[PDB]
Subunit: 133 residues, 10 copies
DNA sequence: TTGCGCTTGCGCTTGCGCTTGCGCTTGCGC
DNA sequence: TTGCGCTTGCGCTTGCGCTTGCGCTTGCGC
């Protein structure tokens, strides 16, 4: 009743369940396996929605991503995009769609270009839990 | 009689939790719901709840929170009062405009080339006390 | 020990432990009365023997009679499809008209630009006694 | 110990515990005889070795034979079709035995295979090539 | 709590969960049921992505696949009953790294989301692409 | 050189060109073959657009149409074998002028480009909408 | 004087001069007997009065009857179908006689009418309602 | 051999041919009937392409349109849009798509908005023929 | 006097005056030799009697033999379709594979994800002598 | 023997012109072509011309002009040299990137989610002297 | 690669969210 | 509204053009 299981997709695509003895260690477990490129769950449509004040020091390993100035996630490179307010300000991580990207993740934009979003940092209130330790 | 419930956390992670007894299920739903965790998918058309549950509905049951808007999985939904016609019954709907990222299967086409995405509709039915804020 | 995974009345994904396989159906009846369902409606609707239609236990699939069948917040209507002899067997179908929120894959195109969504069809087969209200 | 997840004859999602892996196929046969299935029909149908067709144990995929000899699976009827080898240098097609049915109005697009004469088929299984697996046959 | 579970789809398509005693043993369990043609999870869109230096001695049993040479001399990989051709894609410098791609032509039964439209009205379906990165030794045949 | 030609589609669908002696006689020629149900050109997308003050006494023969009241009391217009209902659309002030629209439900044989998706999964096909503008007297019944 | 534009039996776009409008239908019959057509099949098929069906002059649309009694038009065969009136207060359907064929692989989507059983039909003409037009009948 | 016919769609949608005795009067004939709202031919996909130096004094009656600050054409209102160079400078006339507009004329742009173009004024060299007399 | 409208080898739309109807076909032959065509290829291709295939005058439709048929810059291949007796008449078809520039409405879907574009089919009917090379 | 040719003018107007004799047709095509008038449509895939006509092709024949680009109906097309492969024949293609306004039926899908619109391809065939600049 | 299965009367409603420089490749399976 | 018609072996290629504040409505035909 304090125990928890989390289901990951590994670096090799495998569906693996990890047992967490203590609930409160959940984020540590996500960080641990995230550093190995394991992910849990799916990218929400439109990308993860995070508070804008979380962007500067976001722990990318939480979603199994890493910095490289790019963000690599499940073998894809995402570019950082600064969207000045005009519309609230936002910082978006996205990439150009690939021929293999299915329709439902493609976002049509100017010039017949399509984007695929990993995350957008905008609004909300900072959650210290999301930052690098 | 132990139960398990599967959640999607605020970070999207798929996590399973144990529950001692079925009578505690809703309490566990509210606890994790308050952190923005959700269990299951928004059904097509949105959740269908009894209209007499709308005024005091415990939104944490589905991982949602009031803000006069409902926030659910990073999205804001507006309250829409749909007056009965006599034939359509009265209804209170929570829905948002479609975003470029919303997949086709959740988009409801409306007048004026506007598409809506539904979170919930409170309509008809019989009030369930357990759905209200405690 | 078996485990059965339900979608609850609130859409939550909950797993129930069942001590004895002989109880499996009793457990589905029990929670089905609360409107919990397990698994998905098969494309075309569930397929049951026609000799099970008159006394079918709808709680087995989380539905209830109301003269309509209510399943996951939708009302389905009873449809007597007479046999023909160009050669069609008798059948009793439960289906509703498609809503704007119904996704393409559940819609069945019909005469007059109407689309139906199917819950169940009672056709042919051999009567299974356990499907009946005990 | 293994666990296998079934969809019952009532569509319910049920998990079974299997004490040792050597009993895996026994447990699959046992519940498959009850019409329970585990997993989805792979796109194109299951692919099995051609020399497994004659004595294939259909309960392994929760199907059964019925009398024309049809295979019943999830309340649908599938027909046995002999696809004769084509030995041209152009189109080489190996012998196959395919179990498929005409598409219904309720079948979604992703299971429909478009064919000659505006007909669509839905595949359950194809038996072709491969090498016989004894454990697939009826015991 | 040291233990893991891994979900496979067996050679008969069945959804079977296996217990693993220690995290360190994960890849070995995958190899074991992999040789039986069991797979875990889905082919990622665009195929698995592996380091180019891992291609020569990649352990295909990790993803439930096996190598097979055609009578015509084709280098093939068999995964879930489908054959994928080994394709050498030369570097271009338009900048494109060298790559080794495993893909097959689309079949009538392939859903749209796995089809990659290519030249001459051909559609390809990807299993894997070996490209860039740095070599992970654990990925190799032992 | 004072002369014009007008192309009609007859009641039998035939493509027939008619000579007109003077420009001034154009609308009268249209009325003449219009009464026979001959039409010229296509229904514009969204239906013809006419001034609202022209609706009450519009000469439907100008577009090869005719009025017809149903036994249920419906005000209808018949054009190329189809019936279009008269619909009164009240002003809204979201700003929308009052309008009188002639439209029918889509048929199975109607191509996609003429269908206007509306509420409740209904599709409408438009003949004409009377809305705004100022009255042209030539449009009226003489 | 009128001009009528035909599509010949060879598909050619040919314009004919007609000295006086009273001869219009005569000229339509004359070339229609040669299989020439003028204009397109209206969507849904031509719509003609029901009491014109029995003695309709098919050459008016460049069609002809052939022996089952079929109508041939642009090298396609159309079947006569009697659609019996439905007099319910719910669905009121007048008697009709429809000439239509099953859709071919070459028929584009805009002529295909989707029906029961995944069948598509292509319409040539429907005879229903209206009032008899004598000039439509065979002379 | 100096004669010319021009085919118009009238204000009532009718397909009418006008005989022009002298070729050189073609533009006068277009202006004359254009003032009555008659048009000849179709709007090219993407709108008519005119030289940017023709925009200030363009004779809208040439394409059967008129000013009203809007341009009315075949019963539709088009808005003038100034697109500062960044991309050459351009002046576009377009409107929001209507529910009745067929797919092939709709131009998807930001925010699920679709536009329908009448004309774009850009590049080229001024043609005095196109200006108001 | 008749008028016939051609699309020329340069795609130009040109109308030719024909003094006598009896000459109509001779005029189509004349310009067809220059690769001018009149009207459109009917959906499914032209339909001619099977007894006209062996000596068909291709210039009538602006085509020429080259063993292929060339029409408007495309090569079409001859296709002997044997009769069967489930019941198909004999037929000789002229068609080519679809190009990436071919629009959807001319494509005929076939086995192996191949699409064909049809020029003509010689099937049934009764031989029309005027269709032949004179 | 009088002919008529139908043009789309630089303003899009549909105009018909008379021609005294067929031998003057191309001269009339060039005259009006020089003003940007076109006759007929660009065929699907583009005009198909003989490769040995490319170097000195009279673009005014189709209402086009050189500028190293070809301008046609307000659009600019690039020359693309497609080397033979041995099996593909050599080819010189004039095509532009698709615009948001280009309808689907003219768009040719290529590598990299790029779509092309073709004006013309010079490939194979036999040189026609009358197609060259005089 | 295959020959083909179906049937039913219908449910609505709402104002709208936006942004980004783009990634390619392969021969093909009936 | 209707019962159903089919067949064929396949042709490729190219670097890319961009922009805009948005218009609604109707009950439905088999
Ligand atoms: Ca900190
Ligand atoms: Ca009993
Ligand atoms: Ca001036
Ligand atoms: Ca002869």
């Amino acid at each position: 009743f304090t125990m928890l299981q989390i289901e990951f997709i590994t670096d090799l695509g495998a569906r693996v369940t990890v047992n967490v003895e203590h609930e409160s260690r959940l984020l540590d477990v996500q960080r641990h396996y995230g550093r190995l490129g394991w992910t849990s769950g799916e990218i929400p449509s439109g990308g993860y929605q995070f508070p804008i004040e979380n962007e500067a020091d976001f722990d990318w390993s939480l979603i199994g991503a890493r910095k490289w100035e790019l963000v690599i996630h499940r073998g894809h490179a995402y570019r950082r995009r600064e969207l000045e307010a005009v519309l609230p300000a936002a910082i978006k991580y996205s990439r150009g769609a690939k021929v293999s990207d299915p329709q439902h993740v493609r976002e049509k934009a100017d010039g017949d270009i399509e984007y695929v979003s990993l995350a957008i940092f905008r609004g909300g209130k900072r959650q210290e839990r999301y930052a690098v330790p």
